[PDB]
Structure 1
Amino acid sequence: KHSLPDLPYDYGALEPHINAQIMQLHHSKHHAAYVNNLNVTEEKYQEALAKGDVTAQIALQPALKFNGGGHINHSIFWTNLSPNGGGEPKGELLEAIKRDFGSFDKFKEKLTAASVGVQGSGWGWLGFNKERGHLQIAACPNQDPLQGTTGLIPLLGIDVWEHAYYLQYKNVRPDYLKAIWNVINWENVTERYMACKK
């Protein structure tokens, strides 16, 4: 059984960068929808699985990738932002970003171009490639999860579905991305990094 995680800050804690109204609808409407449908779908699936019914298992796959992915991605998302975040990573995480993108700024330009560039709904991700020992940016469509579709471990992700910025920045998806770099909980992406290194 899956549950909606509690938000770790209040809904208006990230104003002026992302405001309360967006935070509230994102969490308790959208994310709530995903874990409920995830729970329904996993249940239908199990029953299909027991009957040995392969047509049903395959029929169910799009709902399980959409709702399972939504739940995963929004859950990493909420911990990736903090009332008290922004600035630059430190330690090993920042030297991996220098090692792989040249510098933090060339890292920002590249994750801003990938997120801005998604055609339709999607997410931009900073991920860890454990097969190669290095950081990598990937973009994903719809709610498709970074690890399950790609194999990379998600460290920082940015929602660019229009429900994530539209009441506030309207169509200006670059203004949302300039705003977002101000609330990034670098302390959490460092920890995400650190568990791969384990």
Structure 2
Amino acid sequence: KHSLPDLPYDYGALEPHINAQIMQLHHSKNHAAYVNNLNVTEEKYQEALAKGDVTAQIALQPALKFNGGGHINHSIFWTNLSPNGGGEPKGELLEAIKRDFGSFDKFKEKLTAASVGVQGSGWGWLGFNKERGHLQIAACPNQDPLQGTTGLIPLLGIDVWEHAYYLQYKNVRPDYLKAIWNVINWENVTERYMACKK
């Protein structure tokens, strides 16, 4: 059913901002484990649902949210990065950022603060509030996906799990966040943003 998507760039394409070892491991080991367990949990849920086992379906929720979210999160993350990214977004998105956060630098601080703030494992997200018609920064615990738990549309996600920066930046999460702005695929983020107004 579910597959591990190919990275749209090589492992060391985000150097030095994100090394090739973090990239190789994060993709081929972490994301891959998510994709597998998701398939197995999804099939065990199918059997339970068809059998009317409500207890089982409920006992499988944690594994489904974790591995499902893990696959949703990482898939979006790969597309959010790029060796040709960085700088500031172009077009409407940069303008929407001006409205909702004041300026690009203010947006940068806020999302960096939401990411640095995650106590434990989690993600920092720039999303879109469909009901409201504006952008919205949000953080999520462990592998809880943005849309499935808040209804917000993911535009730019920054993984702040220790596995996404420890081998290189160690305990200095702030340095990791500062290095990632250099490899942000703004063309992708503007794609997802434009796809919302639809």
SS of 1:3's partner is coil
What CA deviation, in whole Å up to 9, does each residue of 1:109-167 have, x standing for no partner?
Answer: 00000000000000000000000000000000000000000000000000000000000
| Cα offset, 1:90, TM superposition | 1.2
> Which residue number in structure 2 is paired with residue 100 of structure 1?
100
> Which residue number in structure 1 is paired with residue 130 of structure 2?
130
RMSD: 0.4
| Cα offset, 1:91, TM superposition | 1.1
Distance in 2 (CA, whole Å) between partners of 1:91 and 1:184 is 15
Distance in 2 (CA, whole Å) between partners of 1:94 and 1:183 is 17
| Ranges in structure 1 where 5+ consecutive residues have no aligned partner | none
> Which residue number in structure 1 is paired with residue 175 of structure 2?
175
Distance in 2 (CA, whole Å) between partners of 1:97 and 1:163 is 29
Distance in 1 (CA, whole Å) between partners of 2:155 and 2:119 is 22
Distance in 1 (CA, whole Å) between partners of 2:76 and 2:151 is 16
SS of 1:171's partner is coil
Do residues 120 (structure 1) and 116 (structure 2) align?
no
| Cα offset, 1:26, TM superposition | 0.1
| Cα offset, 1:71, TM superposition | 0.1
State the identity as a percent.
99
Distance in 1 (CA, whole Å) between partners of 2:30 and 2:93 is 31
SS of 2:124's partner is strand
Distance in 2 (CA, whole Å) between partners of 1:125 and 1:145 is 10
SS of 1:13's partner is helix
Distance in 1 (CA, whole Å) between partners of 2:182 and 2:13 is 12
Task: State the TM-score, normalizing by the size of structure 2.
Answer: 1.00
